[PDB]
Amino acid sequence: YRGSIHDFPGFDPNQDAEALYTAMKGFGSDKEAILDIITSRSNRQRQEVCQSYKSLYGKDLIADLKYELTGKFERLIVGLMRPPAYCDAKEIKDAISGIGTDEKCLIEILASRTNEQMHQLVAAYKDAYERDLEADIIGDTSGHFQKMLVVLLQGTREEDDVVSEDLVQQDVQDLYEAGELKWGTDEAQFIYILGNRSKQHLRLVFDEYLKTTGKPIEASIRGELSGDFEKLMLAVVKCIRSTPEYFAERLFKAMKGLGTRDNTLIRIMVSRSELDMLDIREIFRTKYEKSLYSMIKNDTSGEYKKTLLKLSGGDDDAAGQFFPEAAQVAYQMWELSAVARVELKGDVRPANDFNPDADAKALRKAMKGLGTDEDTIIDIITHRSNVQRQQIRQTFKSHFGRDLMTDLKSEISGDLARLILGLMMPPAHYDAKQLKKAMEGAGTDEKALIEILATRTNAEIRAINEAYKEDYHKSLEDALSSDTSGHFRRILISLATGHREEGGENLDQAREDAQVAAEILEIADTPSGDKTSLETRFMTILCTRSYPHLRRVFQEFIKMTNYDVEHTIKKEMSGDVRDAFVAIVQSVKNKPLFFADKLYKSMKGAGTDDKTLTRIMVSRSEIDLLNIRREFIEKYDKSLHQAIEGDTSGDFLKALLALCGGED
Ligand SMILES: [Ca+2]
Ligand SMILES: [Ca+2]
Ligand SMILES: [Ca+2]
Ligand SMILES: [Ca+2]
Ligand SMILES: [Ca+2]
């Protein structure tokens, strides 16, 4: 059983009907009591309580509940009192009701329900509103989208069993030629393969595709379809592979940032409460490093909150090892990171017809005088590669006998100046400066230290070292030594050597590495007391092993000690040490995703971490910023463009957009 709401307690409907009637007596009502009663009884039990409440007081419990309760709490409670099928039927009903259509709700349900759930959905809709749900959906939908919904609606997907190795091989071929191999995608073929084959088969097919092709099936889909249809197809894919991970995602997006998408929050927490909430919880904590529970807590309030938390659970015997579903998703994130062929692309490309003489002039004319023309500067610099900017710098000083850097630092100011000068600096020097500004001054800007050092490559590090010695007349190691100390200094200096192995995998050694990991974390038995960590062995592995090899270690680690390394590190480790290793891990797992996260974080909450924003935007400008934006939009349901637009203003907002890739 993977449902959160315990499979029944040992009740009697009559005692609850009396307890609930009681809670609703007098002025007001005992919300805590109603909440505690209804959220600790399974749905079946709740149907009986309804039956009892009816025979004892001759009334409708739900009606009485709608009377005493209001708002989110009302909705949620009542939502919990209706049978699953009747539940889905009103969500779809309401999704279709009104002029606007909630396509997100439609997708989530039609993409996640099994053949049987589908049948009971249709049947309940027929009884509740006395109407055909298929005609209603066709009446509110259009195109390939409506086609796929209608197919999913039939509830006739092949059963899981007879695995035709050959048919799997065939569907991979058909899917590859219907997509990757042509401009656009054969929608029809995808609607047929993904809508009829069993979930079992489709999984086997997605794996063969990823292995046979250098990419996941989704990579061939994303950006090759259009509108709601793309979103829909992407959702059946995620559901086939893992519906619990899908809901884990939908849950995260409903609480993204300012505000909540309550209705969705209600739909999921309730509908999945007796199916796979526990699985959802596990996956959620592996992809968001923050309880489903914690986020439900910090984004809701009152008895409404109370209930949601109940429907989830968030302390049932601490963390504990993975269950099948989550272990697969975890294992697969690594597999993917390990074998996927990905094109790393930046957003700033060399300008064509590049004329340094023309730019150098324009830049000067834009500054020459009392005023100062920001647009010319911003528009020129942001749209010119770094290599091209150095040329402009040489040409500028040759034409006017004055340094372009010095003039710019004079004509512009604020966040813009930090961003413009930043672009103007050669890469190895820019990071050297940032490293310099994280140690220079009182205290240490740890975050910026980890970011740079757990992220840059050997070639980049060797360069940063020289760039550093040349600009500040000192080595990077020693500069590190002064500003920091303890374990943090050690890991920071190891990484900064830029000697990390660049060699291939190696199974045997991976298992040995993971073993020390298992030890570093798992410390039960008599040494139950957290004996912290196990030697410098762990640090050497995370700091000096090759990325391809680490992905192996982390994969074997999961096979072995049933946890994910990132999880356990947060366990036995803390502060700058915990954070340094986690950054390392995330860097090898999905570097682009790591920068996306940091961006989200820098504009999340109260104000803006203007420094982190530009550091990333500048240094990733010509590497993987496009990949970054792809990840960003995927995980945060919002484009990088929109985020920047709502967190910054002025010319800074101007220069930032001009640097950022194509909206999204
Ligand atoms: Ca009352
Ligand atoms: Ca929110
Ligand atoms: Ca001026
Ligand atoms: Ca300092
Ligand atoms: Ca903000």
XYZ file of C-alpha atoms and ligand atoms in Angstrom:
669
model
C 0.000 0.000 0.000
C 1.364 3.388 -1.034
C -1.511 5.624 -0.010
C -1.119 8.145 2.790
C -4.531 7.993 4.385
C -4.023 4.805 6.367
C -6.013 1.895 5.076
C -8.788 2.291 7.672
C -8.338 2.692 11.486
C -10.891 0.310 13.050
C -14.056 2.397 13.090
C -17.843 2.481 13.020
C -19.651 5.085 10.904
C -22.234 5.832 13.599
C -19.673 7.075 16.126
C -18.338 9.471 13.487
C -21.743 10.730 12.399
C -22.452 11.520 16.054
C -19.008 13.051 16.497
C -19.467 15.219 13.380
C -23.056 16.243 14.223
C -21.711 17.196 17.651
C -18.904 19.303 16.189
C -21.506 21.198 14.190
C -23.769 21.896 17.176
C -24.075 25.350 18.708
C -22.683 28.474 17.105
C -19.773 27.856 14.764
C -18.234 24.402 14.461
C -15.311 22.282 15.659
C -13.176 22.445 12.510
C -10.177 20.699 14.084
C -12.514 17.865 15.027
C -14.220 17.593 11.628
C -10.785 17.723 9.997
C -9.308 15.087 12.292
C -12.312 12.805 11.800
C -12.676 13.031 8.028
C -8.950 12.896 7.207
C -8.244 9.783 9.265
C -11.057 7.747 7.688
C -10.639 6.170 4.250
C -12.976 7.261 1.450
C -14.973 4.023 1.664
C -15.413 4.665 5.390
C -16.420 8.250 4.652
C -19.131 7.004 2.317
C -20.526 4.906 5.170
C -20.352 7.778 7.663
C -22.470 9.663 5.142
C -24.858 6.727 5.165
C -25.014 6.798 8.989
C -25.315 10.560 9.330
C -28.300 10.185 7.011
C -30.197 7.546 8.928
C -29.604 9.120 12.340
C -30.447 12.790 11.704
C -32.317 12.501 8.396
C -29.962 15.045 6.818
C -27.115 15.282 4.290
C -23.712 15.489 6.009
C -22.206 17.230 3.006
C -24.975 19.823 2.955
C -24.379 20.480 6.662
C -20.626 20.689 5.900
C -21.146 23.241 3.110
C -23.165 25.226 5.655
C -20.609 25.290 8.484
C -17.496 25.476 6.332
C -16.382 28.031 3.764
C -13.508 28.681 1.375
C -10.595 26.431 0.577
C -11.254 24.406 3.746
C -14.876 23.901 2.685
C -13.993 22.839 -0.873
C -11.243 20.478 0.348
C -13.377 18.805 3.059
C -16.315 18.241 0.701
C -13.864 17.094 -1.941
C -12.758 14.416 0.500
C -16.353 13.297 1.148
C -17.226 12.378 -2.426
C -16.328 9.064 -4.131
C -13.130 9.212 -6.273
C -14.995 8.856 -9.593
C -17.591 11.427 -8.589
C -14.592 13.533 -7.554
C -12.792 13.428 -10.893
C -16.142 14.059 -12.608
C -16.645 17.466 -10.984
C -13.065 18.532 -11.574
C -13.558 17.750 -15.268
C -17.030 19.247 -15.072
C -15.688 22.511 -13.648
C -12.750 22.403 -16.048
C -15.219 22.466 -18.943
C -17.713 24.794 -17.241
C -17.397 28.513 -17.894
C -16.046 30.228 -21.010
C -12.383 29.544 -20.333
C -11.172 25.944 -20.279
C -8.754 24.618 -17.671
C -6.547 22.636 -20.069
C -4.101 21.902 -17.254
C -6.744 20.073 -15.222
C -7.950 18.112 -18.290
C -4.415 16.983 -19.151
C -3.515 15.944 -15.610
C -6.556 13.674 -15.329
C -6.825 12.167 -18.806
C -3.066 11.566 -18.822
C -2.932 9.898 -15.357
C -6.095 7.775 -15.019
C -5.950 4.022 -15.709
C -8.406 2.231 -18.021
C -10.730 1.463 -15.060
C -10.504 4.863 -13.401
C -11.401 6.267 -16.828
C -14.501 4.086 -17.072
C -15.669 5.032 -13.579
C -15.024 8.688 -14.453
C -17.248 8.586 -17.507
C -19.944 6.594 -15.682
C -20.034 8.960 -12.688
C -20.220 11.981 -14.941
C -23.176 10.330 -16.645
C -24.981 9.901 -13.348
C -23.967 13.179 -11.693
C -24.767 15.512 -14.590
C -26.679 13.088 -16.809
C -24.598 13.756 -19.917
C -21.915 12.257 -22.140
C -18.430 13.245 -20.995
C -16.868 12.442 -24.382
C -19.196 14.814 -26.268
C -18.538 17.503 -23.642
C -14.782 17.200 -24.080
C -15.100 17.338 -27.860
C -17.322 20.383 -27.421
C -14.582 22.258 -25.540
C -11.418 20.980 -27.221
C -9.718 21.131 -30.604
C -7.311 19.372 -32.956
C -4.667 16.808 -32.108
C -5.342 17.724 -28.519
C -8.989 16.673 -28.638
C -7.954 13.579 -30.575
C -5.560 12.321 -27.883
C -8.044 13.135 -25.085
C -10.722 11.092 -26.855
C -8.305 8.141 -27.198
C -7.209 8.309 -23.526
C -10.924 8.577 -22.807
C -11.765 5.145 -24.220
C -9.863 3.435 -21.425
C -8.750 0.621 -23.724
C -4.974 0.612 -23.396
C -3.460 -2.863 -23.808
C -2.901 -4.703 -20.514
C 0.570 -5.153 -18.955
C 1.896 -8.637 -19.751
C 2.862 -10.214 -23.079
C 6.086 -8.344 -23.834
C 6.855 -8.557 -27.547
C 10.571 -7.730 -27.583
C 10.082 -7.358 -31.331
C 7.132 -4.944 -31.041
C 9.177 -2.855 -28.617
C 11.940 -2.709 -31.218
C 9.340 -1.784 -33.829
C 7.687 1.018 -31.829
C 11.113 2.537 -31.222
C 11.709 2.593 -34.971
C 8.242 3.984 -35.766
C 8.554 6.658 -33.072
C 12.050 7.613 -34.309
C 10.956 8.071 -37.940
C 7.741 9.805 -36.939
C 9.783 12.338 -34.989
C 13.570 12.845 -34.880
C 13.916 11.892 -38.556
C 11.708 14.663 -39.933
C 10.851 18.341 -39.730
C 7.866 18.195 -37.407
C 6.224 15.103 -35.932
C 3.709 12.546 -37.157
C 1.154 13.405 -34.482
C -1.089 10.499 -35.529
C 1.590 7.864 -34.981
C 2.397 9.236 -31.513
C -1.264 9.384 -30.548
C -1.509 5.745 -31.561
C 1.662 4.340 -29.951
C 1.415 6.324 -26.715
C -2.344 5.897 -26.343
C -2.788 2.137 -26.899
C 0.356 0.223 -25.895
C 0.491 -0.899 -22.278
C 2.307 1.210 -19.700
C 4.701 -1.713 -19.303
C 5.524 -1.811 -23.030
C 5.871 1.951 -23.408
C 8.399 2.027 -20.552
C 10.481 -0.694 -22.246
C 10.174 1.326 -25.456
C 11.321 4.610 -23.856
C 14.470 2.881 -22.515
C 15.342 1.302 -25.858
C 14.840 4.725 -27.418
C 17.122 6.482 -24.980
C 19.752 3.771 -25.435
C 19.434 3.356 -29.237
C 19.085 7.103 -29.722
C 21.337 9.484 -27.871
C 18.271 11.151 -26.322
C 15.026 10.519 -24.419
C 11.782 10.300 -26.412
C 10.701 13.587 -24.835
C 13.669 15.375 -26.416
C 12.257 14.477 -29.813
C 8.828 15.718 -28.735
C 9.630 18.952 -26.841
C 9.467 21.819 -29.336
C 8.300 19.587 -32.210
C 4.576 19.733 -31.528
C 2.571 22.841 -30.641
C 0.238 24.331 -28.026
C -1.749 22.330 -25.477
C -1.052 19.206 -27.526
C 2.650 19.327 -26.755
C 1.910 19.782 -23.060
C -0.554 16.883 -23.218
C 1.774 14.466 -24.998
C 4.566 15.414 -22.610
C 2.269 14.575 -19.738
C 1.278 11.080 -20.886
C 5.010 10.393 -21.355
C 5.778 11.476 -17.768
C 2.785 9.451 -16.525
C 3.706 6.265 -18.350
C 7.231 6.512 -16.988
C 5.980 7.546 -13.551
C 2.626 9.112 -12.665
C 3.794 9.677 -9.042
C 6.701 11.812 -10.356
C 4.251 13.651 -12.576
C 2.036 14.585 -9.622
C 5.144 15.392 -7.613
C 5.866 17.919 -10.331
C 2.327 19.297 -10.638
C 2.354 19.694 -6.829
C 5.588 21.682 -6.977
C 4.283 23.973 -9.705
C 1.048 24.720 -7.813
C 3.125 26.314 -5.073
C 5.943 27.649 -7.280
C 6.214 31.107 -5.733
C 3.940 33.974 -4.708
C 0.527 32.471 -4.067
C -0.799 28.968 -4.712
C -2.874 27.158 -7.308
C -5.093 25.840 -4.513
C -7.688 24.079 -6.696
C -4.902 21.963 -8.175
C -3.370 21.441 -4.717
C -6.771 20.171 -3.553
C -7.334 17.931 -6.566
C -4.016 16.100 -6.254
C -3.666 15.728 -2.480
C -7.178 14.233 -2.393
C -7.303 12.137 -5.575
C -3.897 10.589 -4.863
C -4.341 10.172 -1.119
C -5.267 6.512 -1.460
C -3.073 5.629 -4.422
C 0.550 6.800 -4.414
C 0.965 9.789 -2.100
C 3.860 8.056 -0.296
C 5.643 7.508 -3.617
C 4.940 11.120 -4.561
C 6.457 12.220 -1.261
C 9.709 10.347 -1.878
C 10.241 11.550 -5.450
C 9.279 15.064 -4.369
C 12.054 15.120 -1.756
C 14.584 13.899 -4.306
C 13.810 16.587 -6.879
C 13.061 19.587 -4.654
C 15.180 19.195 -1.514
C 12.208 20.378 0.536
C 9.322 18.248 1.838
C 6.020 18.175 -0.003
C 4.887 18.729 3.587
C 7.196 21.699 4.189
C 5.990 23.469 1.041
C 2.381 22.723 1.884
C 3.143 24.239 5.279
C 4.755 27.454 4.039
C 2.124 28.122 1.383
C -1.156 27.582 3.236
C -2.722 28.336 6.609
C -5.536 27.588 9.020
C -7.481 24.352 9.176
C -7.120 24.279 5.403
C -3.403 23.802 5.935
C -4.029 21.300 8.722
C -5.937 19.006 6.373
C -3.493 19.156 3.428
C -0.650 18.208 5.772
C -2.678 15.218 6.956
C -3.331 14.054 3.426
C 0.435 13.962 2.970
C 2.428 12.963 6.036
C 5.877 14.416 6.681
C 7.810 12.664 9.446
C 6.748 9.006 9.237
C 9.963 7.509 10.646
C 12.326 10.193 9.307
C 13.537 9.740 5.732
C 14.142 6.018 5.332
C 15.203 4.100 2.247
C 13.553 4.421 -1.166
C 10.612 2.394 -2.326
C 10.559 0.841 -5.848
C 8.979 3.797 -7.664
C 11.264 6.530 -6.271
C 14.371 4.367 -6.506
C 13.657 3.947 -10.234
C 13.124 7.658 -10.822
C 16.320 8.357 -8.850
C 18.320 5.681 -10.644
C 16.993 6.986 -13.963
C 17.909 10.631 -13.406
C 21.509 9.428 -13.190
C 21.254 6.958 -16.045
C 19.970 9.792 -18.230
C 22.636 12.278 -17.110
C 25.144 9.525 -17.858
C 24.110 8.541 -21.377
C 22.180 11.400 -22.904
C 23.749 13.213 -25.868
C 23.106 16.874 -25.195
C 24.008 19.945 -27.185
C 25.335 22.699 -24.944
C 24.484 26.104 -26.436
C 24.783 29.684 -25.218
C 22.656 32.715 -26.087
C 25.291 35.193 -27.203
C 26.680 34.411 -30.653
C 29.355 36.320 -32.597
C 27.711 39.122 -34.522
C 27.924 38.860 -38.314
C 29.522 41.623 -40.366
C 31.446 42.353 -37.186
C 33.039 45.780 -37.510
C 35.164 46.671 -34.491
C 35.943 50.113 -35.923
C 32.210 50.876 -36.166
C 31.442 49.581 -32.672
C 34.409 51.322 -31.073
C 33.186 54.620 -32.549
C 29.516 54.149 -31.626
C 30.554 53.209 -28.079
C 32.609 56.407 -27.808
C 30.025 58.676 -29.437
C 27.533 57.166 -26.986
C 29.709 58.307 -24.070
C 31.444 61.361 -25.517
C 29.949 64.335 -23.728
C 27.919 65.161 -20.663
C 25.115 62.735 -21.352
C 25.483 58.992 -21.823
C 23.640 56.688 -24.224
C 22.903 53.405 -22.441
C 20.971 51.781 -25.305
C 23.829 52.009 -27.783
C 26.170 50.551 -25.151
C 23.774 47.811 -23.981
C 22.661 46.911 -27.512
C 26.233 46.681 -28.772
C 27.983 44.864 -25.919
C 25.289 42.289 -25.126
C 25.012 41.217 -28.790
C 28.753 40.758 -29.268
C 30.631 37.615 -28.251
C 33.340 37.895 -25.631
C 36.085 37.333 -28.198
C 34.598 40.140 -30.250
C 34.493 42.446 -27.206
C 38.214 42.152 -26.606
C 38.769 43.177 -30.223
C 36.491 46.173 -29.664
C 38.585 47.000 -26.598
C 41.852 46.948 -28.509
C 40.371 48.985 -31.374
C 38.852 51.519 -28.993
C 42.161 52.256 -27.226
C 43.903 52.389 -30.606
C 41.443 54.971 -31.949
C 41.251 57.249 -28.926
C 44.251 56.363 -26.796
C 41.914 55.669 -23.881
C 40.849 52.454 -22.150
C 37.264 51.384 -22.887
C 36.917 49.741 -19.505
C 37.870 52.972 -17.698
C 35.400 55.061 -19.744
C 32.516 52.637 -19.245
C 33.135 52.549 -15.481
C 32.634 56.299 -15.781
C 29.581 56.600 -18.021
C 27.385 53.904 -16.487
C 26.592 52.789 -12.953
C 24.759 50.403 -10.663
C 23.724 46.895 -11.595
C 24.098 47.757 -15.269
C 27.758 48.727 -14.828
C 28.466 45.542 -12.937
C 26.833 43.613 -15.817
C 28.371 45.546 -18.711
C 31.940 45.575 -17.349
C 31.404 41.930 -16.530
C 30.669 41.051 -20.162
C 33.677 43.146 -21.165
C 36.015 40.926 -19.145
C 37.710 37.867 -20.614
C 36.184 34.677 -19.024
C 39.141 33.397 -16.933
C 39.594 36.910 -15.625
C 35.869 37.429 -14.840
C 35.749 34.360 -12.544
C 39.054 35.401 -10.972
C 37.489 38.748 -10.086
C 34.365 37.124 -8.675
C 36.466 34.760 -6.599
C 38.441 37.808 -5.503
C 35.292 39.697 -4.428
C 34.058 36.712 -2.384
C 37.113 36.710 -0.138
C 37.963 40.410 -0.284
C 36.196 42.247 2.520
C 34.808 41.126 5.857
C 33.397 37.623 5.885
C 33.128 35.241 2.979
C 30.621 34.977 0.182
C 30.577 31.175 0.466
C 27.730 30.694 -2.000
C 29.783 32.372 -4.750
C 32.841 30.323 -3.854
C 31.084 26.970 -4.181
C 29.240 28.007 -7.317
C 32.435 28.789 -9.211
C 34.678 25.989 -7.930
C 32.265 23.048 -8.012
C 31.185 24.177 -11.463
C 34.201 25.183 -13.562
C 36.240 22.606 -15.560
C 39.967 21.844 -15.301
C 40.813 23.943 -18.364
C 38.721 26.730 -16.881
C 40.323 26.325 -13.461
C 43.907 26.324 -14.744
C 43.029 29.521 -16.564
C 41.360 31.071 -13.496
C 44.529 30.364 -11.526
C 46.764 32.312 -13.881
C 44.154 34.975 -14.468
C 44.086 35.299 -10.692
C 47.822 35.477 -10.134
C 48.186 37.997 -12.975
C 45.452 40.359 -11.799
C 46.080 40.138 -8.068
C 49.687 38.954 -7.831
C 49.068 35.864 -5.738
C 47.892 32.282 -6.264
C 44.282 31.141 -5.880
C 45.116 28.476 -3.304
C 46.769 30.933 -0.937
C 44.063 33.555 -1.442
C 41.659 30.795 -0.451
C 43.788 29.894 2.560
C 43.596 33.373 4.034
C 39.871 34.051 3.640
C 38.662 30.591 4.732
C 39.634 27.573 6.814
C 38.469 24.242 8.217
C 36.860 21.562 6.079
C 35.534 24.243 3.729
C 39.035 25.437 2.843
C 40.177 21.878 2.102
C 37.409 21.051 -0.363
C 37.723 24.487 -1.921
C 41.497 24.058 -2.469
C 41.207 20.532 -3.820
C 38.711 21.595 -6.511
C 40.796 24.679 -7.308
C 43.782 22.515 -8.275
C 41.960 21.648 -11.481
C 43.499 18.173 -11.503
C 40.184 16.292 -11.351
C 40.412 13.021 -13.228
C 39.034 13.216 -16.751
C 39.174 9.476 -17.223
C 36.383 7.071 -18.043
C 34.153 5.110 -15.657
C 35.270 1.743 -14.196
C 32.681 -0.457 -12.441
C 34.701 -2.086 -9.654
C 36.199 1.170 -8.371
C 32.755 2.802 -8.521
C 31.382 0.204 -6.102
C 34.297 0.800 -3.742
C 33.710 4.570 -3.860
C 29.981 4.176 -3.194
C 30.815 1.844 -0.325
C 32.704 4.543 1.525
C 29.677 6.725 0.818
C 27.381 4.142 2.351
C 29.677 4.298 5.381
C 29.940 8.093 5.443
C 26.185 8.148 5.833
C 24.636 4.900 7.068
C 25.900 4.725 10.657
C 23.423 2.671 12.695
C 24.257 -0.250 15.008
C 26.284 0.644 18.119
C 27.866 3.639 16.334
C 24.278 4.922 16.136
C 25.587 8.293 17.254
C 26.314 10.371 14.156
C 30.072 9.810 13.989
C 30.053 12.555 11.329
C 31.946 11.360 8.229
C 34.534 8.792 7.102
C 37.964 10.200 6.331
C 39.313 12.322 3.522
C 38.353 9.356 1.339
C 34.910 10.869 0.605
C 36.293 14.330 -0.181
C 38.848 12.933 -2.620
C 36.118 11.010 -4.416
C 33.720 13.963 -4.781
C 36.585 16.393 -5.520
C 38.850 14.269 -7.735
C 36.815 11.541 -9.446
C 35.578 12.029 -13.019
C 31.993 13.086 -13.686
C 31.266 10.033 -15.863
C 32.643 7.895 -13.024
C 30.768 9.666 -10.271
C 27.486 9.118 -12.087
C 28.391 5.420 -11.853
C 29.198 5.630 -8.132
C 25.878 7.347 -7.447
C 24.035 4.751 -9.536
C 25.646 1.833 -7.744
C 25.135 3.618 -4.417
C 21.372 3.558 -5.005
C 21.482 -0.122 -5.980
C 23.416 -0.656 -2.770
C 22.343 1.336 0.329
C 18.850 2.204 -0.922
C 19.283 6.006 -0.743
C 20.386 8.768 -3.097
C 23.728 10.376 -2.247
C 22.453 13.964 -2.338
C 19.870 13.003 0.292
C 22.291 11.352 2.696
C 24.821 14.224 2.395
C 22.166 16.630 3.682
C 21.812 14.061 6.452
C 25.281 13.513 7.876
C 26.592 16.877 6.670
C 25.697 20.532 7.149
C 26.497 24.126 6.281
C 29.192 25.022 3.771
C 30.445 21.449 3.762
C 27.049 19.926 2.976
C 26.457 22.659 0.397
C 29.840 22.221 -1.302
C 29.385 18.499 -1.944
C 25.743 18.877 -2.990
C 26.844 21.502 -5.527
C 29.461 19.062 -6.794
C 26.877 16.298 -7.113
C 24.353 18.561 -8.820
C 27.085 19.861 -11.105
C 27.808 16.375 -12.418
C 24.127 15.401 -12.475
C 22.703 18.339 -14.446
C 24.920 21.407 -14.594
C 22.408 23.439 -16.604
C 19.710 22.578 -14.006
C 22.015 23.740 -11.218
C 22.386 27.234 -12.774
C 18.623 27.389 -13.428
C 17.928 26.720 -9.741
C 20.404 29.365 -8.608
C 18.699 31.854 -10.894
C 15.273 30.996 -9.531
C 16.634 31.418 -6.019
C 18.180 34.836 -6.713
C 14.818 36.370 -7.676
C 12.620 34.404 -5.262
C 11.042 35.977 -2.210
C 11.572 39.573 -1.095
C 14.154 41.387 -3.200
C 16.775 40.329 -5.731
C 20.220 38.840 -5.364
C 21.447 41.062 -8.215
C 24.982 39.676 -7.814
C 24.128 36.010 -8.348
C 21.823 36.849 -11.247
C 24.495 38.641 -13.310
C 27.362 36.332 -12.341
C 25.415 33.427 -13.880
C 24.011 35.424 -16.831
C 27.501 36.639 -17.671
C 29.568 33.441 -17.280
C 27.019 31.124 -18.874
C 26.192 33.605 -21.613
C 28.173 31.616 -24.195
C 28.112 28.086 -22.801
C 24.784 26.587 -21.749
C 22.471 29.504 -20.962
C 19.976 28.146 -23.509
C 20.064 24.750 -21.829
C 19.767 26.651 -18.580
C 16.616 28.430 -19.772
C 15.168 25.143 -21.013
C 15.581 23.618 -17.521
C 14.336 26.784 -15.891
C 11.085 26.884 -17.805
C 10.600 23.113 -17.361
C 10.899 23.094 -13.576
C 9.485 26.523 -12.730
C 6.570 26.664 -15.161
C 7.886 30.140 -15.974
C 10.402 31.349 -18.564
C 13.671 32.939 -17.467
C 12.505 36.007 -19.431
C 9.334 36.457 -17.344
C 11.220 36.022 -14.078
C 13.814 38.653 -14.938
C 11.051 40.993 -16.193
C 9.265 40.838 -12.855
C 12.327 41.222 -10.612
C 14.396 43.939 -12.286
C 13.911 47.381 -13.797
C 15.617 50.123 -15.749
C 18.527 49.572 -18.072
C 19.585 46.582 -16.026
C 16.302 44.944 -17.023
C 17.158 46.114 -20.530
C 20.696 44.683 -20.666
C 19.541 41.462 -18.966
C 16.822 40.766 -21.523
C 19.127 41.575 -24.429
C 21.512 38.928 -23.058
C 18.909 36.297 -22.237
C 17.871 33.863 -24.954
C 14.664 34.002 -26.964
C 11.854 34.596 -24.445
C 10.610 30.961 -24.272
Ca -23.299 24.986 14.642
Ca 3.018 29.689 -3.756
Ca 28.882 60.688 -20.963
Ca 36.889 38.615 2.917
Ca 12.211 38.820 -5.761
